[PDB]
Amino acid sequence: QLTPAQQAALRNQQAMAANLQARQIVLQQSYPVIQQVETQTFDPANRSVFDVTPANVGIVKGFLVKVTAAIKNNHATEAVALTDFGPANLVQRVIYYDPDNQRHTETSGWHLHFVNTAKQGAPFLSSMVTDSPIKYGDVMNVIDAPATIAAGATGELTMYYWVPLAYSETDLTGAVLANVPQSKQRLKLEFANNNTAFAAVGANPLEAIYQGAGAADCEFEEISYTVYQSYLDQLPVGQNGYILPLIDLSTLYNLENSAQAGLTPNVDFVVQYANLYRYLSTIAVFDNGGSFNAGTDINYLSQRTANFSDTRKLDPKTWAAQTRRRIATDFPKGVYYCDNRDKPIYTLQYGNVGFVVNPKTVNQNARLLMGYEYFTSRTELVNAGTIS
Amino acid sequence: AQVQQLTPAQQAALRNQQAMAANLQARQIVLQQSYPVIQQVETQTFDPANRSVFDVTPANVGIVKGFLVKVTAAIKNNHATEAVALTDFGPANLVQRVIYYDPDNQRHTETSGWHLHFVNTAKQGAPFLSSMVTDSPIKYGDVMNVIDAPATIAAGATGELTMYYWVPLAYSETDLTGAVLANVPQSKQRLKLEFANNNTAFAAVGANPLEAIYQGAGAADCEFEEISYTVYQSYLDQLPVGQNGYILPLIDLSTLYNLENSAQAGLTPNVDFVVQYANLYRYLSTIAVFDNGGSFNAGTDINYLSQRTANFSDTRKLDPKTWAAQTRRRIATDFPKGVYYCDNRDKPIYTLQYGNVGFVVNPKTVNQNARLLMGYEYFTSRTELVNAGTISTT
Amino acid sequence: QAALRNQQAMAANLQARQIVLQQSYPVIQQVETQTFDPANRSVFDVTPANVGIVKGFLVKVTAAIKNNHATEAVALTDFGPANLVQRVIYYDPDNQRHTETSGWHLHFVNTAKQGAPFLSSMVTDSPIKYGDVMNVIDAPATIAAGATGELTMYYWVPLAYSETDLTGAVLANVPQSKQRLKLEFANNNTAFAAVGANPLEAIYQGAGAADCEFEEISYTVYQSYLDQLPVGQNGYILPLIDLSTLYNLENSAQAGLTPNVDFVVQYANLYRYLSTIAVFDNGGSFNAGTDINYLSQRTANFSDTRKLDPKTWAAQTRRRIATDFPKGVYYCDNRDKPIYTLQYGNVGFVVNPKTVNQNARLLMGYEYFTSRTELVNAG
Amino acid sequence: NAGTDINYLSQRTANFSDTRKLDPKTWAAQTRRRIATDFPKGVYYCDNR
Amino acid sequence: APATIAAGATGELTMYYWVPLAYSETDLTGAVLANVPQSKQRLKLEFAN
Amino acid sequence: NRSVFDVTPANVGIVKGFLVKVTAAIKNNHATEAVALTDFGPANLVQRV
């Protein structure tokens, strides 16, 4: 007793036990509701940035965003073809904001798709090809895009995005309480337009959808989007009011992305985990000057700690072998996943953690596109004994 | 009482003095034990051809001191040959109306956008959020373009406007009179905002550019592309707790600090036009705008301005150039053409009988459909706003 | 239960400060003057006089810059003549550092305390010839090939906070000790930057900066103090808490900026921070807010208290200094309620950038109060 | 005119703001519930019974 | 509403709906007490296309 | 572009109902043939509330 460091450790142990108890009361007594909040069809030649107001009901868990599009190739003779990211570049940016102006997610289009893949164990909303004579397979075309739009043809695209607030369906960490009176929540959505979704032969196809010799005449016709809100209702009521997990709702499950530049061949390139977050995953995309290679331009990927010690330091084919253990496939050409969900990276446990890439080949205008996925809470920072 | 109806000692016997001494003690405890927070509460971007009136939900926290409203616009001029030019009120006409309702569904401020801008100027002592030009070699100046608007949008061009509004609830950062205690779980608190649209923001040549933003021979083809707005709420968090709940200044929170506007017509040349002040309000300043039938002049159509009282008739009967000299001692410049400012912050008009104090304009030349556009700020002390009347009469 | 005595010690401190400010005499006197050539020497140590209660210093720097290039010219940077002094260090007679900051940071705190650009002339509409007559702070905008320009710059080095608040001042009561006022000046390797180089600490930048050099730099130090101090029944009458408090100006430098990520700069745990100035050096490039998403001040690394975009952040400083700080410079005023934690990093300064170039750093200038562990031994 | 020359009609108070601020066709909708027709052009009815 | 719209013409439509919560103006059965600390009421509207 | 809208009114007092005024403009771009009103008419402007 009597020391504020261990007096705070005792009430953090009691608050964590009462939070896990109140969580499973909620997940037993509530009901999952999913309802549509907005639908709009537009033209990207006029406007391509939209803001959606979700409903302030219940405990919000996340958003399902269907994006449908039509693309005409108006070239005379030349065709185009899909990129490696493809229809995941239909959305360029997803931003969500709390009713307290707390930013939750600021992914790109491709980074939100890869976190949806890595949290399923398979490519997101795909259908496996089986040997069954019963006609399963690709019936409804949930995520669909033509591989080639010829000169004069038209291609229908479909894409789905799960924008997560809560962590999972059994972990309500990051969910937004919305059954109290408060400000409105904000879900900003920037879409692909006629400048960012078609790339010429030789341009950087990172955020493009199609690339080819007829991309100068390609254009959009329509883009429709539908947003569905997934939330919990009929919340349980106790003797003191609502029974709520009080430090799960005040924790943020976030999905930033970033970038860095300045890579030198055969020199270790460190991207530090900057803030005091609890990092859960990490996606590195090696944009080697518009070129994307399957590990032949990287010597090793690694993760360092404070005393310069690698806690994993693998070949690019061995880094991809740990990816196949989780999602049962490979991420696209140039994308490197790092799972840390069992022991999250926290730069207050063993010092400062970094992310290392040692490149073998470096082209001009080469960069490393990062994507983070982490937890954020409020750090309590008591004084231990002496002040001086 | 020789000038005023009630002297400041006569209107101090109409108040409880032990409740006022307990009120200034409670304000000093709040202002030294709280933390000033400013927080963005709403942001959305729209087309005014689709929607132009918006209701903003603030945050129910602390003691709210006011709102900062940032407005950004993207005016396009689709004419073939002709250009338009910025009016005198300019980007201050981006917001047409401002209404605030508190947690108890009581309105506080209901005024226009140009009147809110001039009270923002009159309380700073300078044009609001502007940068002065100096002769420093270090590159100070207008770097960030906080309030910005191009002076001319040509035929086939686009202009970007930026405008800021302080919507006051509390009177100042040291005087919490007018502030709103908002730590109650309700939803009646809102901030209604009507914006400029394609009809009210572009005036033709020879029209009335009072509420317009641009004016010119190519104003029929001018359109908005986009208007964004951002609302920031300034408040005081972590209120001091003693016994009996929070320690709060009870007279400061049961008093409103409002901004209201009204229009009076019926001016004739070379006689007095007495716009009467009203019973039971406590007036702090007065903006008068002489719209001389769509024409605005630099004092060349007024004989004199004055304030008026029942006994002791005139108190500041001055020439228009001398009226402007008393406001260059206030805001270090003068207001645009047609705008005249009267200050009453030292001795506020609180007068217990309706038309006891009046505001006089003696015009030289009156065009057809001429009017005075008044703007008032006042303390009105809830439990007597229910027994009040209309803010002005002519 | 200890505020019954500590508020009485503050009441006796304010009651004794007013006696000093009304019974003493404010004097300003020249202490040192020197004219030198920066090719030989550019660090100078100045010994002020040990007299009275010292309030601050009024260093003025005059330079002449010759452009020996054949065809090309140079031009002023955004910080301009404020980079004539590179470092200002002051030391107490009791070996206590009172201010260690840069020249550009000292100039902006001079701006931030006036409410206007420091010692500038406001342009008005008057027909009476006011304006820039005496050229108190002046510098030519472009020095052509073969021309010479004359610069003048003034620096107020503060010891006390203001002229009515003697918090931070030095009682110069020890004849055997002495004060130190080390001043580092610009030279030919600092004041001239080439095209594309970092213009942060430079004075002139252009295509002819390889042949630009100083001809001379002169400086003059004036000292403001309170003469004729009132004497009581035992020693001087003094505000003891006011003189047992430092008023410091420091500058730092952080790095590790990535786009779309919150970059937090933690405050220390025992200072009372009055103002923060953040300069976004985006790899030798300075932008007018178009590379920052927002700036903020969050408490427990979670909850922001003033999170604003760069145009609303600049709107809060136009209420303070009635103009805008130069490109990349961002001011944060905390003078009404100073930032004061008891635990390290329990308040931070946040910059969320949008575009980050290589060699991007964030320069942080601070201004704060610090108490000493005991009183200052009057006599 | 049949509401063509009016932005809105209203009924204010001092404490409260506008109580029934309506456009001229919605003000007319409140009178078609009263007298089951419209008044002639320019005539506007306000019931406070 | 106009009765017909000819080839090349344009018609203007106007229509009012009353969404009821209380039963009548003298019977408050069905009305919503929105002085509650829960949340904001919603009114979803599908239009023609 | 959009057909469904969600309106979020304030929580004041005892709510009695909502008045919804719908205005429209229908252009007939056919070459020769015209269209005529149905029996439900302008009441099919709001499809679902």
Here the CATH number for the domain that contains residue A320 is 2.60.120.20
> Min CA distance, C112 vs chain B (Å)?
12
Query: Cβ separation of F4 and A39 shorter than 8 Å?
Result: yes
Helix, strand, or coil (residue B250): helix
The answer on B143 and B38 residing in a single domain is yes
| B349-362 per-residue burial string, b: 16 or more CB within 10 A, e: under 16 | bbbeeebbbbbbbb
If you measure CA to CA, which chain D residue comes closest to F20? D26
Torsion of CA C366, C369, C370, C376, to 10 degrees: 130
For residue B333, what are the domain limits?
243-394
Question: Within the 1-49 window of chain F, which residues sit less than 8 Å (CB to CB) from chain B?
Answer: 10-13
Give the span between the Cα atoms of A216 and A221, in whole angstroms: 15
**Sign of the CA dihedral C75, C78, C83, C86?**
negative
> Min CA distance, C296 vs chain A (Å)?
12
Compute the C-alpha angle A287/A289/A291, nearest 5°: 70
Query: Cβ separation of F2 and A40 shorter than 8 Å?
Result: yes
Query: Cβ separation of F34 and E1 shorter than 8 Å?
Result: no
> Min CA distance, E19 vs chain A (Å)?
21
Q: Is C192 exposed, middle or buried (0-12, 13-18, 19+ CB in 10 A)?
A: buried
Which 3-state string (H, E, C) describes chain C?
Answer: CCHHHHHHHHHHHHHHHHHHHHHCEEEEEEEEEEEECCCCCCEECCCCCCCCEEEEEEEEEEEEEEECCCCCCEEECCCHHHHCEEEEEEECCCCCEEEEEEHHHHHHHHHHHHCCCCCCCECCCCCCCCCCCCCCCECCCEECCCCEEEEEEEEEEECCCCCCCCCCCEECCCCCCCCECCEEECCCCCCEECCCCCCCCCCEEECCCCCEEEEEEEEEEEEEEEECCCECCCCECCCHHHHCEEEEEEEEEEECCCCCCCEEEECCCCCEEEEEEEEEEECCCCCCCCCEEEEEEECCCCCECECECHHHHHHHHHCCCCCECCCCEEEEECCCCCECCCCCCCCEEEEEECCCCCCEEEEEEEEEEEECCCCCCCC
Query: Cβ separation of A181 and F3 shorter than 8 Å?
Result: no
Nearest to A97 by CA among A200, A171, A160, A184: A184
**Measured between CB atoms, which of A258, A271, A387 is closest to C260?**
A258
> Min CA distance, E39 vs chain B (Å)?
7
The answer on C82 and C12 residing in a single domain is yes
F43 φ, ψ (degrees, to nearest 5): -75, -15
Name the one residue in this structure whose structure tokens are 């950087």.
A204
Query: Cβ separation of A101 and B41 shorter than 8 Å?
Result: yes
Residues in chain D with CB shorter than 8 Å from the CB of B104 are none
The answer on B382 and B393 residing in a single domain is yes
Q: Which chains touch A (3 or more CB pairs under 8 A)?
A: B, C, E, F
Q: Say if residues C83 and C186 touch (Cβ distance below 8 Å).
A: yes
Residues whose CB falls within 8 Å of the CB of residue B278, separated by 6 or more in sequence, listed in order: B354, B388, B389, B390, B391, B392, B393
Residues in chain E with CB shorter than 8 Å from the CB of B185 are 37
CATH code assigned at B201: 2.70.9.30
If you measure CA to CA, which chain F residue comes closest to A54? F6
Strand partners, C362: C254, C280
Mutate to test the interface with D, among F19, F20, F22, F23 (most CBs of D within 10 A): F19
Give the span between the Cα atoms of C299 and B238, in whole angstroms: 13
Residues in chain E with CB shorter than 8 Å from the CB of A56 are 39-40
Q: Is B297 exposed, middle or buried (0-12, 13-18, 19+ CB in 10 A)?
A: middle
Give the span between the Cα atoms of B51 and E40, in whole angstroms: 21
Give the span between the Cα atoms of B363 and B321, in whole angstroms: 14
> Min CA distance, F41 vs chain D (Å)?
19
Residues in chain F with CB shorter than 8 Å from the CB of E23 are none
Pairing mode of beta strands A278-287, A335-339: antiparallel
Number of domains making up chain A? 2
CA A356 to chain centre: 21
The answer on C242 and C202 residing in a single domain is no
Give the span between the Cα atoms of A342 and B68, in whole angstroms: 45
Give the span between the Cα atoms of B251 and C289, in whole angstroms: 42
The answer on C258 and C192 residing in a single domain is no
The residue among B175, B210, B242 that closes a domain is B242
The answer on C308 and C203 residing in a single domain is no
> Min CA distance, F2 vs chain A (Å)?
5
The answer on A51 and A24 residing in a single domain is yes
Concatenating the DSSP letter of every residue in B114-148 gives HHHHHHHHHHHTSSTT----B--SS--BSSS-SSB
Pairing mode of beta strands C192-193, C204-206: parallel
User: What resolution in Å is listed for this PDB structure?
Assistant: 2.8
Give the span between the Cα atoms of B195 and B71, in whole angstroms: 9
Residues in chain A with CB shorter than 8 Å from the CB of C345 are 381
> Min CA distance, B203 vs chain E (Å)?
27
Rg of the Cα atoms in chain C = 22
> Min CA distance, C307 vs chain B (Å)?
7
On whether any CB of chain F is under 8 Å from the CB of B187, the answer is: yes
Please list the alpha-helical segments (H only) found in A155-250: none
Compute the C-alpha angle A88/A92/A98, nearest 5°: 110
What are the Cα distances from residue C176, in Å, to A366, C179, C225?
A: 63, 10, 19
The answer on A179 and A287 residing in a single domain is no
The answer on B199 and B297 residing in a single domain is no
Query: Cβ separation of A181 and E40 shorter than 8 Å?
Result: yes
Residues in chain B with CB shorter than 8 Å from the CB of C306 are 37-38
Residues in chain D with CB shorter than 8 Å from the CB of F19 are 26, 29
Query: Cβ separation of E14 and D29 shorter than 8 Å?
Result: no
Chains A and F are in contact, defined as 3 or more C-beta pairs closer than 8 angstroms: yes
Technique used by the depositors: cryo-EM
Residues in chain F with CB shorter than 8 Å from the CB of A42 are 1
> Min CA distance, B145 vs chain F (Å)?
35
Within 10 angstroms of residue B83's Cβ, the number of other Cβ atoms is: 18
Query: Cβ separation of E35 and B186 shorter than 8 Å?
Result: yes
Q: Is D30 exposed, middle or buried (0-12, 13-18, 19+ CB in 10 A)?
A: middle
The answer on A207 and A342 residing in a single domain is no
What is the helix (H) or strand (E) element at residue A304, kind and residue range? Answer: strand A298-304
The residue among B208, B242, B276 that closes a domain is B242
The answer on C50 and C184 residing in a single domain is yes
Name the one residue in this structure whose structure tokens are 């006696």.
C19
The residue among A206, A238, A270 that closes a domain is A238
Residues in chain A with CB shorter than 8 Å from the CB of C346 are 381
The answer on C218 and C78 residing in a single domain is yes
Question: Within the 79-138 window of chain A, which residues sit less than 8 Å (CB to CB) from chain B?
Answer: 100-101
Helix, strand, or coil (residue A6): helix
| Tokens matching residue C226 | 């309170």
Query: Cβ separation of F19 and D25 shorter than 8 Å?
Result: no
- Type of residue numbered B77: N
Residues in chain A with CB shorter than 8 Å from the CB of B41 are 101, 183
